[PDB]
Amino acid sequence: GWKYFKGNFYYFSLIPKTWYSAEQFCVSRNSHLTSVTSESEQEFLYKTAGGLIYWIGLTKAGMEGDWSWVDDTPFNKVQSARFWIPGEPNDAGNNEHCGNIKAPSLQAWNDAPCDITFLFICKRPYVP
Ligand SMILES: CC(=O)N[C@H]1[C@H](O[C@@H]2[C@@H](O)[C@H](O)O[C@H](CO)[C@@H]2O)O[C@H](CO)[C@@H](O)[C@@H]1O
Ligand SMILES: [Ca+2]
């Protein structure tokens, strides 16, 4: 049930998991929680999400609490600023160190507690 989009396959889970158990699931399927590196990828993801909430590969790194991608895609603070839901990230409760796709809009991301369970999206490159 992997969906193909521009050189990558994506798995939209049917079962919710915490961020890290989701990541571990992805890794077991030779993938990672998805990165988002273009407007078109963001659009494919939120449209496919169909208004439900999915963990993506957004998580905190370094002592400064910079956002990063678990698949090691360099996180571009400038090119991504427009992908957060207006008002996010807010570190609500100072315990929101992971990111999900939440709104069906280009401004789609919310930061949420890593230990909360949601559906999730794995991403796997097609290697011919
Ligand atoms: C834990 C979490 O997702 N917090 C975000 C928060 O979401 C909450 C729900 O968890 C709660 O059950 O319902 C209220 C509305 O009734 C919120 O949707 O919402 C915050 C703002 O949207 C967000 O910043 C939190 O991270
Ligand atoms: Ca938040």
Numbering used by the authors: 198 to 325
Please share text taken word for word from the publication where this structure appeared:
A version of the truncated, trimeric langerin mimicking the naturally occurring minor allele with Asn-288 mutated to aspartate and Lys-313 changed to isoleucine (langerin-D288/I313) was created and compared with the form with only the K313I change (langerin-I313) and wild type langerin. To determine the molecular basis for the enhanced binding of GlcNAc-terminated glycans caused by the K313I change, crystal structures of the carbohydrate recognition domains of langerin-I313, langerin-D288/I313, and wild type langerin in complex with GlcNAc, α-Me-GlcNAc, and two GlcNAc-terminated trisaccharides (GlcNAcβ1-3Galβ1-4Glcβ-CH2CH2N3 (TR54) and GlcNAcβ1-3Galβ1-4GlcNAcβ-CH2CH2N3 (TR55)), representing the terminal portions of poly N-acetyllactosamine chains that are ligands for langerin detected on the glycan array, were solved. Because several of the structures show the same interactions, to simplify presentation of the results, only the data sets that gave the highest resolution structures are shown: wild type langerin CRD bound to α-Me-GlcNAc and trisaccharide TR54, langerin-I313 CRD bound to α-Me-GlcNAc and trisaccharide TR54, and langerin-D288/I313 CRD bound to α-Me-GlcNAc, α-Me-Man and trisaccharide TR55. Structures of the double mutant, with Asp-288 as well as Ile-313, with α-Me-GlcNAc, and with the extended GlcNAc-containing oligosaccharides, showed exactly the same pattern of interactions of the N-acetyl group as were observed for the Ile-313 mutation alone. Thus, the differences in the interactions of Lys-313 and Ile-313 described for the single site mutant can account for the enhanced binding of GlcNAc to the naturally occurring Asp-288/Ile-313 variant as compared with the wild type CRD. However, in all the observed orientations, there are hydrogen bonds between the subterminal galactose residue and the side chain of Lys-299. These contacts would not be affected by the variations at positions 288 or 313. The K313I polymorphism is tightly linked to another SNP that results in the change N288D, which reduces affinity for glycan ligands by destabilizing the Ca2+-binding site.
